[PDB]
Every structure is written in structure tokens, then in C-alpha cells.
């Protein structure tokens, strides 16, 4: 619905930890919504979550890893 | 399926990192299977994938944060 649009996902990232090594925008571009606790983010499509972001993580890489069959990660939204 | 039994999940943990702060028995108890990569474990029921385990982590608690609607976590398998 709304969260197919990158910008709407990005908007969920109010209060996202300023010091995270992986930026809010990178995480939204990788299909994530911010959960509002920690650096825990959750894909709008597959509903699978990822936390504990470290310098050098690929936001798309870790997503594919946890949800290789995610519709977003495999291009179902274009 | 067969992974409803704890013992069947625990079997998947050979060569799981011996220095893991969270033990193999503890993660199997929390519904996890070992993926065979690093300290990455996946839930047999909700396919959530969690790694980077640290001291103080609850296997169950972390599993519920990443998949609050997990069938395993919510009692589905009785
Ligand atoms: O399974 C899920 N998500 C999932 C499952 C059970 C519970 C939940 C869950 O707690 N969902 C929700 C959490 C939080 C929220 S929120 O706080 O309100 O925003 C949710 C909100 C709305 C809906 C959900 S929902 O319950 O997912 O419906 C939320 C999520 N996603 C998913 C979607 C598409 C593909 C994959 C995936 O890559 N799976 C797999 C991944 C990996 C493996 S592996 O063992 O490595 O071969 C799979 C193996 C066999 C089958 C699969 S399969 O069929 O693709 O599910 C494997 C995974
Ligand atoms: Zn996804
Ligand atoms: Zn689960």
C-alpha cells in the first residue's frame, strides 16, 4: 500500500538512532521500516526484522539473507 | 514438521561456535535451527534469522522481538 514508496518507509525513521553505522535512508531503500526500538528495522513486505547493524553492513545483503524469498528483495515491486 | 521436537533442532548445531555467548541448547529451546553459517540460526516456524549473539541476549526474547507473531513463540505447536 503506502510502504511500497521509499519515502513513506523513510518517514517511519523518526527517532532512529543518530549514531547507527547504517543510515536511515539506506535502510528504507532496502525495504525497511523502523520499529521504534533500538536499530531494529522490519521489512514492510516480508515482515522480517533485522537489528544490530555494524559498520560495513549491506542493508540489502542482510535483508536477502534473512528473507531470500522476500517479494521486495526479489523485485516484485519494480 | 520434524523440527517441532527440540532434540531435532538441537541436532542441527554441530560446529556451532563453542564460544557463543548463547548456547546451542538455549537457541534450540527457543525454536532455532543452526544455519551452518557463523552464529546464524533460523526459526523452524517463522524463518527469522538471527546472529551476532551477545551476553545478556535472551534467545526467546530476541526471537519475539524479531517475530512477535511467530507460531512457535505463541504456542501453536502446543
Ligand atoms: O515468514 C515471514 N515472516 C514472518 C513469519 C511469521 C511471523 C511473522 C511476524 O511476526 N510478522 C509480523 C511482525 C511484526 C509486524 S508489526 O510489528 O505489526 O509491523 C507485523 C505486521 C503485519 C504483519 C506481520 S505478519 O505476521 O508476517 O503477517 C507482522 C513474520 N516472512 C517471509 C516472507 C517471504 C519469504 C520469506 C522467506 O524468505 N522465508 C524463508 C527463509 C528461509 C528459508 S530456509 O530455511 O533458509 O530455506 C525458508 C525455507 C522454506 C520456506 C521459506 S518461506 O516459504 O519463503 O517463508 C523460507 C519470509
Ligand atoms: Zn523483506
Ligand atoms: Zn519463530
Curated annotation (Swiss-Prot), chains A, B:
* Outcome reported for the amino acid change (mutating residue 67 to D/E): Abolishes dimerization. Interferes with ubiquitination
User: Which part of the complete protein is shown?
Assistant: 21 to 98 of 497
This protein is called what?
Answer: E3 ubiquitin-protein ligase XIAP
Quick one: effect of changing residue 55 to G?
Loss of interaction with TAB1/MAP3K7IP1
Known consequence of changing residue 78 to G?
A: Loss of interaction with TAB1/MAP3K7IP1
Which residues lie in coiled coils?
none
Q: What is known of its domains?
A: The first BIR domain is involved in interaction with TAB1/MAP3K7IP1 and is important for dimerization. The second BIR domain is sufficient to inhibit CASP3 and CASP7, while the third BIR is involved in CASP9 inhibition. The interactions with DIABLO/SMAC and HTRA2/PRSS25 are mediated by the second and third BIR domains.
The signal peptide, as residue positions, is none
Amino acid at each position: 500500500e503506502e510502504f511500497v514508496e521509499e519515502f513513506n518507509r523513510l518517514k517511519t525513521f523518526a527517532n532512529f538512532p543518530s549514531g547507527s553505522p547504517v543510515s536511515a535512508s539506506t535502510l528504507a531503500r532496502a525495504g525497511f521500516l523502523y520499529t521504534g526500538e533500538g536499530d531494529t528495522v522490519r521489512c514492510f513486505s516480508c515482515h522480517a526484522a533485522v537489528d544490530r547493524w555494524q559498520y560495513g553492513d549491506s542493508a540489502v545483503g542482510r535483508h536477502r539473507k534473512v528473507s531470500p524469498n522476500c517479494r521486495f528483495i526479489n523485485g516484485f515491486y519494480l
